[PDB]
Design a protein around this ligand. Structure first.
Ligand SMILES: CC/C=C/C/C=C/C/C=C/CCCC(=O)O[C@H](CO)COC(=O)CCCCCCCCCCC
Ligand SMILES: CC/C=C/C/C=C/C/C=C/CCCC(=O)O[C@H](CO)COC(=O)CCCCCCCCCCC
Ligand SMILES: CC/C=C/C/C=C/C/C=C/CCCC(=O)O[C@H](CO)COC(=O)CCCCCCCCCCC
Ligand SMILES: [Ca+2]
Ligand SMILES: [Cl-]
Ligand SMILES: [Cl-]
Ligand SMILES: [Cl-]
Ligand SMILES: [Cl-]
Ligand SMILES: [Cl-]
Ligand SMILES: [Cl-]
Ligand SMILES: [Cl-]
Ligand SMILES: [Cl-]
Ligand SMILES: [Cl-]
Ligand SMILES: [Cl-]
Ligand SMILES: [Cl-]
Ligand SMILES: [Cl-]
Ligand SMILES: [Cl-]
Ligand SMILES: [Cl-]
Ligand SMILES: [Cl-]
Lengths: 224, 224, 224
């Protein structure tokens, strides 16, 4: 009956709870970046735009690769407003209280695990969406699933440029972080499953690769 | 009968006279930039391309945001040729005579006011065009109207790169100039009017916001 | 009977032999770039992506200009695999044997001539493709044919960024190399032929402009 459990796991509604966890973890990472708090004070619109890149950079990149509107996902008003509320609470909540609650390690590890549920679903969705437009476009499927999983990391040089920072000596392709490299392995697996060369159901692959990402990220977050 | 006057004001044909004023003011600003005259001598094609960015950057950015051809507007041959003639006269007219005439302060203030007529129309057109593709895409409407009004300013980091200049410490989002910030207020107003939450006719909003931009820009130009 | 010879010349199948020559010459140029060999060792995925830019940058740029998927051409699996095999053999063949064979000057000059056959065909195809979407879009036709011929050179600032290099003081528009400038003359000629203002058959223009590019590039390669 594992396939019955895997089907329920792979079809949980990500909105709003799992998307909120994705936004919280991503905007927390933004606040850790150098000068981010000062930027929220002096350039609040640019700070909000930076948070939108961290929350929706996966869709911006995937739409750019497929020749669609790069801000197509911003028509989802409820998601944009939810990410905006997360950005406001993390940077401007009185007593910094919202930051204190979501940074509490037991709470943070749960949000970290929930973000990985969202990331794997976005990888698989990118492969399936590219396949719909290119039935045999294996390289387009792998590219779309990769940027859906890596997100803002692949545009880090220009997220820095928006913040007034320029560090051209490195980038996430020249030196992949773990989530970028893991998203590359994930998009190859989901493409192979789309090819019907990997004999596994799409629900089981989602379940087992999500558990791999959850264990890795929770372990990495709890260590440091 | 103000609405009858506002309807005539909001429907004046911008081509060719008001577009010419837009091109003249924008290419004048290009000639003020460092190394622009030297660039016209040594790299005339790059200088012409820079002037096309200043004249049509609003359409390039709006088409990029909506997933359309970024050079779609360059199919308008008469507009491209008119902007090309303006670029040639400003940089290469014998005796620098065309520059001397359009820089004469009474003449320049008139062209500055006429450019603001074009800018407000482009903001409203961007909101209406985005609304046609996304009936409830408020964030897409505001983004499209903003870049239609700000124009080349939002791509200033890469207009500089074309000229061989790189200044990453600042950008027009991190530090908005007045026209960029005013275009942001304008696109919010025209979006609200599109929402039917701002109880005002589209013609009256065009008239009153254009007069606001005309008074501000004419005052700013005459002061410095 | 020259038109009968020109028709056969202009319709030779570029895949796979002429495309292979295009890939070999382009990836050879990549290996000449500073730090390219070290990059293939330490960042092999970024090295492979760099080679894809050199092999398919013409299609990436043309699709970007026309608002299509910038990786649309990567649905051609056989072409991507052939370019991938060329990249692997040039950087990783035991004894560096493949590099030694294709760098042998008589063999290299033949591949250089065959690449020019591909470049002229891509210029003409870009003009014809833009004309199909814009019957009177002369500036869109010239832009599309130019990037189809220049290829990765027009994105050199960002091919360098992928390699961790940033040299903003120059670019291929501000200072055109010979292939970039020759592709600009070529796209004007093919646009004029599309206008029916240049009284010459498309096959004869392909033949005579290819011979011009072959003689120039073979002479330039044999000199240095
Ligand atoms: C301001 C925000 C802009 C950010 C630009 C960041 C771009 C980084 C994205 C890289 C995706 C490459 C996919 C890949 O590297 O992996 C796939 C699977 O292995 C294969 O690569 C290919 O298909 C060949 C891909 C050729 C490069 C595509 C360039 C598209 C230009 C978009 C810019 C408008
Ligand atoms: C070489 C020329 C290139 C120039 C690139 C310049 C880009 C600057 C444009 C910014 C428009 C943001 C709209 C905005 O900031 O304001 C709106 C309204 O408030 C909300 O922002 C969003 O919808 C979220 C917008 C998310 C960013 C969109 C990135 C698109 C990538 C285009 C590059 C191909
Ligand atoms: C990461 C890879 C990105 C690389 C970006 C490189 C861009 C260089 C391409 C230049 C083509 C200009 C065509 C031209 O200069 O020549 C033609 C014929 O004379 C006329 O120019 C116009 O039509 C006006 C063209 C206005 C500029 C178009 C900007 C498009 C933005 C694309 C970025 C997403
Ligand atoms: Ca498109
Ligand atoms: Cl940083
Ligand atoms: Cl601000
Ligand atoms: Cl998704
Ligand atoms: Cl997707
Ligand atoms: Cl098919
Ligand atoms: Cl400057
Ligand atoms: Cl030039
Ligand atoms: Cl408009
Ligand atoms: Cl518009
Ligand atoms: Cl609808
Ligand atoms: Cl270099
Ligand atoms: Cl690698
Ligand atoms: Cl082609
Ligand atoms: Cl083409
Ligand atoms: Cl037509």
């Amino acid at each position: 009956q594992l396939g019955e459990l895997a089907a329920a796991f792979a079809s949980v509604p990500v909105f709003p709870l799992f998307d909120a966890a994705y936004f919280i973890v991503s905007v927390l990472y933004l606040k850790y970046e150098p000068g981010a708090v000062e930027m929220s004070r002096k350039s609040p619109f640019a700070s909000w735009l930076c948070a939108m890149l961290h929350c929706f950079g996966s869709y911006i990149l995937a739409d750019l690769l497929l020749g669609e509107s790069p801000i197509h996902y911003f028509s989802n008003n409820s998601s944009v407003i939810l990410a905006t509320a997360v950005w406001y609470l993390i940077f401007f909540c009185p007593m910094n209280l919202f930051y204190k609650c979501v940074s509490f390690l037991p709470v943070k590890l749960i949000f970290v695990a929930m973000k990985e549920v969202v990331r794997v679903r976005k990888i698989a969705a990118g492969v399936h969406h590219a396949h719909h437009q290119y039935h045999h476009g294996w390289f387009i499927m792998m590219a779309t699933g990769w940027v859906k999983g890596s997100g803002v990391a692949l545009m880090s040089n220009f997220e820095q440029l928006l913040r007034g920072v320029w560090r051209p000596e490195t980038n996430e392709i020249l030196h992949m972080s773990f989530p970028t490299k893991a998203s590359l392995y994930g998009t190859v697996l989901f493409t192979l499953q789309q090819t019907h060369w990997l004999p596994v159901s799409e629900a089981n692959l989602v379940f087992f690769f999500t558990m791999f990402m959850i264990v890795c990220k929770v372990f990495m977050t709890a260590t440091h």
